[PDB]
Amino acid sequence: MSLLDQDYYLSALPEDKRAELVTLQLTIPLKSGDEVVTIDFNEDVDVSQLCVLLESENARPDLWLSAAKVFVSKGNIAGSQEIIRKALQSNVILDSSASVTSLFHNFSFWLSLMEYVSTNSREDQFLEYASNSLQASNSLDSGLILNGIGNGVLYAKSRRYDEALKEFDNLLKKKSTNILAILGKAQILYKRQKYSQALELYQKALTINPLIVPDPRLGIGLCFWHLNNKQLAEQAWHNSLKVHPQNNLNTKILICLAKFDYCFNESKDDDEFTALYRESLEFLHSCLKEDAKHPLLLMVLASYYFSKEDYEKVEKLCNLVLKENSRNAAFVSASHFWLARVAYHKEDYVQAQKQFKQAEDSQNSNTLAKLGYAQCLIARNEVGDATIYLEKFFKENQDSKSSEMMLLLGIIYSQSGKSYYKAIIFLEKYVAVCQEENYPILPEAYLVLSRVYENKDLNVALDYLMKANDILGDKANVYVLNNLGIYHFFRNNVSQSSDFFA
Amino acid sequence: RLLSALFSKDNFRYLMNETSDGLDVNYLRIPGIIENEKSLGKLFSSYKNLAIENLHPDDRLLLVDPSPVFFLRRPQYVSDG
């Protein structure tokens, strides 16, 4: 078949869009007349000398902005800002219309956006710089739709989603072929958790432009993850990596996470689990040979090293991530959770409970941190406190499928005795969730259910005891056999009772 | 081990929130959208020559609904004769 790569959509496009759009050499006419100069961006192009030459020759603003874009690709954000400023100082822009000055103001706006993005810090200062540049551009030329796109992006960064959505509605009124408007709308919808609504926009953008940056396939894979079709997500991410093999390590990280999830939830045997887990570790390490300080990779490796009893290195990585990415609360929550898990072996119940609470406060979506908090409450013999916390969490999250939480609730209520009905409900929910997940149902839940049903239904209790015995197999104990025999004796099953007693 | 099983169930669900770095959109990222002032319009009109057919078959497979039938005509107004 036809190879799926960047060259595929290169050949799909006409040769005008193939070579010219990716030229690393810029042709600049000279002020002397027909003389021109060609400077290759592969070589080390100096910003100051190039700007001085451009000002002397008074070249078209397109060349200035193209050089700025290339220096952006080089990462020279300061150099691109210098290019923009000296272009504003150039005679061409001063003698041109206000439209060119507005376009360069919007370019400086994009420069501020990139400066904020590349650092994820000083957000207010760069946002104010970008806002001032965008306001100047709009005042100089308000008819440019790029000013509206910049306004919408500014609203999105300040979480003014309604105004950005209105701006994208206006852009859709102007034209429905605007790819950037589609991307911004889909980003806002994903931020508003409208995964499917953003997914239609992702598909439309991908169909319109398969070579558009940012990659729509990243959002499509996120939606497939939200729609459980993670296999298609991985396939689309592989296609994106083929199209974008550079500066897209996040796709490889997502692929590694998907592989780890598949290994966890699909390995049919221990040997297959080991093979898949080691392959995922090798792929993660190969990605780490490019970047060795990525906080998410360290957090992921912390799980493996905690499973390897390397708690000291887990603490080192957690502290390093906390120092680097304290802005991200999710990393703080994960580090606190792992510190509490490490201290659990040390049984620092007060310290582990405090760490679990801090993890919950950093990121409330971390259910595991709350479950560890409840477990630590149990460790400190806080039966009532753990019960109150668990009831609060369940009543706030009645739709959450925390099977172990429901099992613990059932056990606590069985110990209480008076709340047997909630215990039955929670144990049945745990049984159903385990059956849906194809996970081994704990026979202890069956024993608790039989104990509860002793005073309600001997038939259901006996059936649950039989199910627990079938799960145990050779693990049947003396108490289970004695209770089965007593059940059959009460059922007048003399033969079966005698066999169970034997 | 109960918390380990809970982690395995959860895996890295809530850790994908930071991975949204691909959602950010910047104009300068595209190489050829800026080389001319109207390169945006040219590239928006460069893909009008392309369609779903020109998409790669594997990328077409990525277009999954969240075939024509012979008995559903498209309406007309002048007919023929």
Binding site: K268, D269, R278, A292, N438 | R1, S4
Partner: peptide, 30 residues
């Protein structure tokens, strides 16, 4: 039988021991 075959140590809770049985050397900074 794949439904019963998949039930093994990691599902039973011996996942940590399995990871301990998998040894790998990283180029750790810390």
């Amino acid at each position: 039988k794949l439904e019963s075959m998949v039930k093994s140590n990691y599902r039973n809770g011996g996942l940590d021991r399995i990871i301990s049985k998998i040894d790998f050397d990283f180029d750790l900074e810390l």
